[PDB]
Amino acid sequence: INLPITGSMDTAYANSTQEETFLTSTLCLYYPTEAATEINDNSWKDTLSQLFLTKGWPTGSVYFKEYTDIASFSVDPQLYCDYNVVLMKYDATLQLDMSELADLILNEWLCNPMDITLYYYQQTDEANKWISMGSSCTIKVCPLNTQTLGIGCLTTDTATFEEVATAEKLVITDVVDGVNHKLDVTTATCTIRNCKKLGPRENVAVIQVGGSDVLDITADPTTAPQTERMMRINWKKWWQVFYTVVDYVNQIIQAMSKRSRSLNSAAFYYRI
Amino acid sequence: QNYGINLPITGSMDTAYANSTQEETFLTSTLCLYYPTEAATEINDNSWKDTLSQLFLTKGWPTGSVYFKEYTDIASFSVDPQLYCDYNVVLMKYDATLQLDMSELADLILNEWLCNPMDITLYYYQQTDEANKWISMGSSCTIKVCPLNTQTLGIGCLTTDTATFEEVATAEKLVITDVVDGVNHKLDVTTATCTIRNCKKLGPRENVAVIQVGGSDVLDITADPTTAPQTERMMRINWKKWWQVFYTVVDYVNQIIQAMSKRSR
Amino acid sequence: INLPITGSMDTAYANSTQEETFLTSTLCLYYPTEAATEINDNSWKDTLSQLFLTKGWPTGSVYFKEYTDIASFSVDPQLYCDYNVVLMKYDATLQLDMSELADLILNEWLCNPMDITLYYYQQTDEANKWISMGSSCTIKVCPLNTQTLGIGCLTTDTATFEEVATAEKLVITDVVDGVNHKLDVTTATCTIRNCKKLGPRENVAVIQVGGSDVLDITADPTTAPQTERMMRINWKKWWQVFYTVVDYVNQIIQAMSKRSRSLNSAAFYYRI
Amino acid sequence: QNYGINLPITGSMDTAYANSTQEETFLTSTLCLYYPTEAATEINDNSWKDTLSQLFLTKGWPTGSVYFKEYTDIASFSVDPQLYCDYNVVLMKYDATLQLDMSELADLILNEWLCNPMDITLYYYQQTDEANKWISMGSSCTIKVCPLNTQTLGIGCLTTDTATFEEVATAEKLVITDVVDGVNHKLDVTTATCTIRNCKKLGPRENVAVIQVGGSDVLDITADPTTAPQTERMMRINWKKWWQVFYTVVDYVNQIIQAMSKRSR
Amino acid sequence: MASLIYRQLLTNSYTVDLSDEIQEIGSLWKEMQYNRDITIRFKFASSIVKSGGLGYKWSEISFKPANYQYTYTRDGEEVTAHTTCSVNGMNDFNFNGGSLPTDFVISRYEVIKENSYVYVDYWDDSQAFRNMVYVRSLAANLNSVICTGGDYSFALPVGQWPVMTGGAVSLHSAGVTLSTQFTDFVSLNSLRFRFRLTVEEPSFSITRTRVSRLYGLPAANPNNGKEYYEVAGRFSLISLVPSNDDYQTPITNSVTVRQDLLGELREEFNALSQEIAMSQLIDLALLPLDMFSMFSGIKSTIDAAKSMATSVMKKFKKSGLANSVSTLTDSLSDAASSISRGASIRSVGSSASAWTDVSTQISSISTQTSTISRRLRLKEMATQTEGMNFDDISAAVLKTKIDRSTQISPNTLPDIVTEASEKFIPNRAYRVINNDEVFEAGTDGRFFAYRVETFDEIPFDVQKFADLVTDSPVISAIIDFKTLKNLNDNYGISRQQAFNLLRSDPRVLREFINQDNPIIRNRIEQLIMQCRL
Numbered sequence A, C: 001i002n003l004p005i006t007g008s009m010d011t012a013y014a015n016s017t018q019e020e021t022f023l024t025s026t027l028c029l030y031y032p033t034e035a036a037t038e039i040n041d042n043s044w045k046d047t048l049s050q051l052f053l054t055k056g057w058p059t060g061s062v063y064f065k066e067y068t069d070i071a072s073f074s075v076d077p078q079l080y081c082d083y084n085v086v087l088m089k090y091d092a093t094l095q096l097d098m099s100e101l102a103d104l105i106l107n108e109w110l111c112n113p114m115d116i117t118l119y120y121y122q123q124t125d126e127a128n129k130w131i132s133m134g135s136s137c138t139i140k141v142c143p144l145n146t147q148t149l150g151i152g153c154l155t156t157d158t159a160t161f162e163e164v165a166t167a168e169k170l171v172i173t174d175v176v177d178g179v180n181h182k183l184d185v186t187t188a189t190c191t192i193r194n195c196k197k198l199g200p201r202e203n204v205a206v207i208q209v210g211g212s213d214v215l216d217i218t219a220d221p222t223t224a225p226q227t228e229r230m231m232r233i234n235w236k237k238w239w240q241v242f243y244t245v246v247d248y249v250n251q252i253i254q255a256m257s258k259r260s261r262s263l264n265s266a267a268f269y270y271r272i
Numbered sequence B, D: 001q002n003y004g005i006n007l008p009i010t011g012s013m014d015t016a017y018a019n020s021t022q023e024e025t026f027l028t029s030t031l032c033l034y035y036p037t038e039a040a041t042e043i044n045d046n047s048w049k050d051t052l053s054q055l056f057l058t059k060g061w062p063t064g065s066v067y068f069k070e071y072t073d074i075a076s077f078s079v080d081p082q083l084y085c086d087y088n089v090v091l092m093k094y095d096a097t098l099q100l101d102m103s104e105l106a107d108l109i110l111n112e113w114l115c116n117p118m119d120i121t122l123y124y125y126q127q128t129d130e131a132n133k134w135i136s137m138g139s140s141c142t143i144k145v146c147p148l149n150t151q152t153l154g155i156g157c158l159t160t161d162t163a164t165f166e167e168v169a170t171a172e173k174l175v176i177t178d179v180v181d182g183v184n185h186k187l188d189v190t191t192a193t194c195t196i197r198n199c200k201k202l203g204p205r206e207n208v209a210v211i212q213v214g215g216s217d218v219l220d221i222t223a224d225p226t227t228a229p230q231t232e233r234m235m236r237i238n239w240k241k242w243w244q245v246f247y248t249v250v251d252y253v254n255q256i257i258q259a260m261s262k263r264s265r
Numbered sequence E: 001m002a003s004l005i006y007r008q009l010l011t012n013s014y015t016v017d018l019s020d021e022i023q024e025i026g027s028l029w030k031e032m033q034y035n036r037d038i039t040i041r042f043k044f045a046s047s048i049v050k051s052g053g054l055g056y057k058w059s060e061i062s063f064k065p066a067n068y069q070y071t072y073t074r075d076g077e078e079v080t081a082h083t084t085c086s087v088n089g090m091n092d093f094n095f096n097g098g099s100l101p102t103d104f105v106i107s108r109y110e111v112i113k114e115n116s117y118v119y120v121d122y123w124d125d126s127q128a129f130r131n132m133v134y135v136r137s138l139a140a141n142l143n144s145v146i147c148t149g150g151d152y153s154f155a156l157p158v159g160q161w162p163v164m165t166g167g168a169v170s171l172h173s174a175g176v177t178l179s180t181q182f183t184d185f186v187s188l189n190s191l192r193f194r195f196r197l198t199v200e201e202p203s204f205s206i207t208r209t210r211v212s213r214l215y216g217l218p219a220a221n222p223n224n225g226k227e228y229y230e231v232a233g234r235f236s237l238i239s240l241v242p243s244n245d246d247y248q249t250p251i252t253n254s255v256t257v258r259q260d261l262l263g264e265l266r267e268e269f270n271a272l273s274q275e276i277a278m279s280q281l282i283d284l285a286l287l288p289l290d291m292f293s294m295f296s297g298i299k300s301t302i303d304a305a306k307s308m309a310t311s312v313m314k315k316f317k318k319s320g321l322a323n324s325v326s327t328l329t330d331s332l333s334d335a336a337s338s339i340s341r342g343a344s345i346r347s348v349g350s351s352a353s354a355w356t357d358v359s360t361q362i363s364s365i366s367t368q369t370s371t372i373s374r375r376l377r378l379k380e381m382a383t384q385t386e387g388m389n390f391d392d393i394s395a396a397v398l399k400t401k402i403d404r405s406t407q408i409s410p411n412t413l414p415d416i417v418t419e420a421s422e423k424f425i426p427n428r429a430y431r432v433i434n435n436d437e438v439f440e441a442g443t444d445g446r447f448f449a450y451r452v453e454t455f456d457e458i459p460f461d462v463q464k465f466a467d468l469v470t471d472s473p474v475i476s477a478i479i480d481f482k483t484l485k486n487l488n489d490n491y492g493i494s495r496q497q498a499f500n501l502l503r504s505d506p507r508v509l510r511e512f513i514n515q516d517n518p519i520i521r522n523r524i525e526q527l528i529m530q531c532r533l
């Protein structure tokens, strides 16, 4: 809608959209198996339901989603809810994994597929990256010089390539933007897609349950931002975490806003 | 460049016709055919894809813009149909024992659904309006439903004895269930094998085009029995081979794309 | 005549031309042998004529012409009358055969013959098709490029061509319009002609005696038209069918209209 | 571009004579000769067709516009003559035993007939005007007629004893029957071998040109025994060979095409 | 100017004949960067054919093509390569000791000299030799080789042996072209270089004979036992890979093109018609866009860049335009010559003039005017006009469309230029001025007589309009009387502006088009939309 919008400053503030956005929206928590394990119960979901029922979120609005592992979740996340919350455990050995997950679900991507054998791909701008998903993505890449020959590599020998990943489930590969790269990837087990980053996804809310903030959404090491839907909690149990979430859900839904672009269930749009 | 906003558009009736978009939208778009395995079996060739692409080349669709995506059967294609292209054509064989399956498939792909998840074990749901339904996908869905009165008691069914529930599906790879809009139902599903989603039908996806290759037009998209409509992108052919079908699709692809309009969502 | 016509809206409606077009025209039914067999009579034709004589159609104006089957009729239909009615049964196997029969008789074609061994032909517009008749036409096609070489086929090995028709008595082939094709055909049994479709033949009238309306006259899968002189009946006998025809023949002839192009005894014009 | 109507035409006498259409119709039209097997026999040359085409090339007709179509005999040609070209020439031999046969052939091809079918078994037909005739074709026809009186009884014939009928044809491949116009006739015909059609004679077919290669002009196109006309496209030739005849045709083809005019229908 | 380009095509048509002679006696996009290195190892062959008798005489010692298949290292990968060497243009000498059966005779033997040329087709399994399907430029810089002949003894069963020795020539690389190697099921695209021969010091000789101090290289033993001769260098090659939205660079070039066949090119032209502007178009319609300037901005393929102008000319001299021109010239000549038996068809004018000979009439004055106006299209490209010369606007549209249109190809531009020249502005009007009285005319059967200062119609004086249009210069109807009068009424106009619009002057035209005059913008847009194809 290229058309403009006009307004004023004398108009009166309307009633609160809260207490109706709850009825007309849904909420979905994503929780790790560790939580249900430490809980050791089978009615905690109905308990949180009846608690939300006091906080104003009606009965058939809340949903829960167990995800066994951060990487297992990173493998093709399917988010279709008018409000999403994700409880992310801290693990220093998974810093880049749960930064890539953040960069993937917090923001909106427009993705084209990739045929490594029939084509040689590149980047255009500083927002055109290669996201690879799957069970074991071992990627290697050769940059080609001005005369379509390899730089520190050979177009025929895959050993000479530069290994950027090693048996990962999700990789966000950024390379020099303006050169042609040949690739070699485990195309049987992983699909790699050339995606452009767009305006953010205001529908999700990541909540790091452990240590100090580490998530670098921005792939350039100059911004290092911290957004409003990127939260942090200190934990020794999980019931306290869920009670916190319940008691302060209104603040989280103030930090979030329903998307504008379109309807979809994935972490990224497909446009071929 | 307002997003997610709607505003009045304005114009006039003296404007000169701007352009002629065919042969440019072709270059800047992608087309995707969805054919059955029967067709490749009858063809018995390893180069027919390249052949059809070279043919489309005459119609203007360049080489790396046309795609083919086989599907074993209507059921296998209805299980999570991931149509992601700028133009989609689907060929669909006729079988009187599959009318409802290949009408559900049409209702699913032709129309744009907004689908929230469903948790049966905890919550008891109801349909609000006439465009609210429950679409269940998976290997084999088996749905059973017990309507409930105002005091959360069953009507012709026992909330504890699942056997008393009323069966609406039996090992189907896709169900689209419409029940009495205004009463709460308790559901039973093979959740370990199939997923059910509470969906609302928005306007129609103008990106796809179904082509019934055989029998008469039977697709009752709208659940209500009064309309039984037939849209522009609901086509019909009579066949005795498949090469003729593909040649016809090619020779009349421009009409198909004039019948289809790129997405709004 | 390229000259223009003129008229007015104050002129009055003249008397009925029905009850004189019967006296100065002829009618010709085309029924299947199944009808005669089910009936098991000899003077049913005289019966129908003496019935017609009440509706106005005189004695020596009605004609009944038998055809053993749909394909036998499809092979060179010699319609030469001032009004033609055809009764055609329903058969899911012969669906396309009796759609091609419709496309052939309902419409007027201008046909040029073809010399396959010596030449290679193409199509120009959306109405230039290739119609082949005979005992069994088994056609195979191989498209070519600008330099007379095959596309997905080999010009020598006939077994690599694309078989569009396998043992069909009447075939109406539409191929991609713009490219040159090479054809392999059973010239000893079938003759194939490049025919352009002119305006409709308003002299004939098809009656589907059985199931739902399936005839797709126009080969493009967007129109799927239902023309005026394309009727449908449900049957358990044939006497009821013929009585319905006789009782509602004036409507059939009101939906038909004598030709304008020319006098010709064939179902298509021949102009070399 | 109105069709099926007759509108008044206008003109003048001040317009100038336009350039000639010959050497343009010669390219945008087609020619078709019909010769007897006797000619090819006497000749015994497998290249005479290409020779005559190369000779026509000088007179203007291109190579792929001329056609030669053989025929074994006048009667075997009279049996279902399917003439479809833009200029047709027919060569015809003189044989006193075939006078009426090769006059019927002329009266058939030179003229344009509006032909409806006939049901001998059921109906008893009659001729309304002097131009409604009954033309019968096949391998061998045997027609027998019986007129009727006011009360549907025979006149010198019995409606049951076919033998009493009057015999107008005896083992003929083509027959053109004109009977008393205004009385109902019954017919007996061997319909297994022959088909009879009730035809009405219209304006001449200006597309065909008959050439009697032999004796005096006997062809009486018109059935009334008062006119006995000789038309423009009704030619005669004297012969002792066939190469000379074909050279004559090739050298005087422009005169033939001037004596002929393309069809109106 | 923009019609001068058509005049130049017609003028330079004479090159099509010699081009066809040569051909007979012979027979979005992107860019990828070769200038890769190569080493060519090859060798010659020989074909010796002896006569019978006692064995002292030979009837042929000739050259023969020679294949070779080897492997070498480049950028750290072992690449398998394949060469094919042959020769052309050699001097066939002969030795003859007598007619007796026992006298040494070589009836014919070949020697390559400076007037010969050798060709070495090359191929390997790298990526360039599958990507070189659409080339933009090709040129190679290779070192030279010195190839010398070795000892060869003739097997005489009796007596002493003749010893062939010496001989040497230097191959330097001069010329690179494409070729093909034909396999059993597929074909391979290859790169054939041409080396020129330069004779060297060692003089070939035939011992025990009167042949010595004879330079060149014969076919007896050209390799001198060497397994091969080896040149080394770099080959520079540019590609026309049909890429897309700026990523996914192909490899193997991954495309087919319109060779599988205009139906859609016409639609492209009808989409590009109205986007064209008017002020800049009039600025471009005054430029003499001769062959270079018309065919420079086309990023052609290596064959189209060689035959583009000739390619369009060989079809441009087949069209209604060229045939009508030749017909007019023949009519004029036959009229100037045939007077004694003079062609008396018609003459609407003072005396017989081929410009005023109505014919093929399949109002009388309307017909005469249209028929006379169908030859002012020939006046346009016969330089007897004064104004914007409508074919010029047509050619400007053509040059403005064929620089944008993606669908342009070697087989394709020919007969597009001609369909343009034939179907651009089919109906078009012209005028002639005489003593301040303008007589117009148009091929659509319309005529208008009118005075310059005060536009008011007048009876159209035929037999005077013809006498004037025959000899006097003509003008075009870009500003035709209808729009001219609408303008003089609404947008009140001055004497000089009106005179310049009658003369169809681009200065005043572009001045109105910049003053935003809809009564001229509409007319120019009509002309564009008629220039549709």
Ligand SMILES: *[C@@H]1O[C@H](CO)[C@@H](O)[C@H](O)[C@H]1NC(C)=O
Residues within 6 Å of the ligand: A014, A015
């Ligand atoms: C807005 O809020 C005020 C204060 O609570 C309330 O009085 C008013 O009714 C609200 N507006 C509407 C439209 O209900």
Ligand SMILES: *[C@@H]1O[C@H](CO)[C@@H](O)[C@H](O)[C@H]1NC(C)=O
Residues within 6 Å of the ligand: C015
């Ligand atoms: C038309 O019908 C009217 C009413 O029956 C009758 O009076 C009239 O004569 C008819 N027209 C002719 C031409 O007979």
Ligand SMILES: *[C@@H]1O[C@H](CO)[C@@H](O)[C@H](O)[C@H]1NC(C)=O
Residues within 6 Å of the ligand: D019, D020, E331, E343, E345, E357, E359, E360
């Ligand atoms: C007819 O002849 C005249 C006189 O030579 C000539 O001017 C005219 O162009 C000719 N007609 C055609 C169609 O060429």
Ligand SMILES: *[C@@H]1O[C@H](CO)[C@@H](O)[C@H](O)[C@H]1NC(C)=O
Residues within 6 Å of the ligand: B018, B019, B021, E274, E275
């Ligand atoms: C049509 O053309 C105008 C200008 O010629 C351009 O601004 C517009 O974007 C074009 N329309 C489309 C759909 O590209």
Ligand SMILES: [Ca+2]
Residues within 6 Å of the ligand: A096, A097, A100, A168, A169, A170, A171, A172
């Ligand atoms: Ca990772």
Ligand SMILES: [Ca+2]
Residues within 6 Å of the ligand: A123, A125, A126, A127, A128, A129, A174, A175, A176, A177
């Ligand atoms: Ca980057």
Ligand SMILES: [Ca+2]
Residues within 6 Å of the ligand: A152, A153, A160, A161, A162
């Ligand atoms: Ca390396």
Ligand SMILES: [Ca+2]
Residues within 6 Å of the ligand: B100, B101, B104, B172, B173, B174, B175, B176
């Ligand atoms: Ca189903």
Ligand SMILES: [Ca+2]
Residues within 6 Å of the ligand: B156, B157, B164, B165, B166
């Ligand atoms: Ca029950």
Ligand SMILES: [Ca+2]
Residues within 6 Å of the ligand: B127, B129, B130, B131, B132, B133, B178, B179, B180, B181
């Ligand atoms: Ca419902």
Ligand SMILES: [Ca+2]
Residues within 6 Å of the ligand: C096, C097, C100, C168, C169, C170, C171, C172
């Ligand atoms: Ca058929």
Ligand SMILES: [Ca+2]
Residues within 6 Å of the ligand: B045, C152, C153, C154, C160, C161, C162
């Ligand atoms: Ca094949």
Ligand SMILES: [Ca+2]
Residues within 6 Å of the ligand: B251, C123, C125, C126, C127, C128, C129, C174, C175, C176, C177
């Ligand atoms: Ca077609």
Ligand SMILES: [Ca+2]
Residues within 6 Å of the ligand: D100, D101, D104, D172, D173, D174, D175, D176
């Ligand atoms: Ca006879």
Ligand SMILES: [Ca+2]
Residues within 6 Å of the ligand: D156, D157, D164, D165, D166
């Ligand atoms: Ca008798």
Ligand SMILES: [Ca+2]
Residues within 6 Å of the ligand: D127, D129, D130, D131, D132, D133, D178, D179, D180, D181
């Ligand atoms: Ca008579």
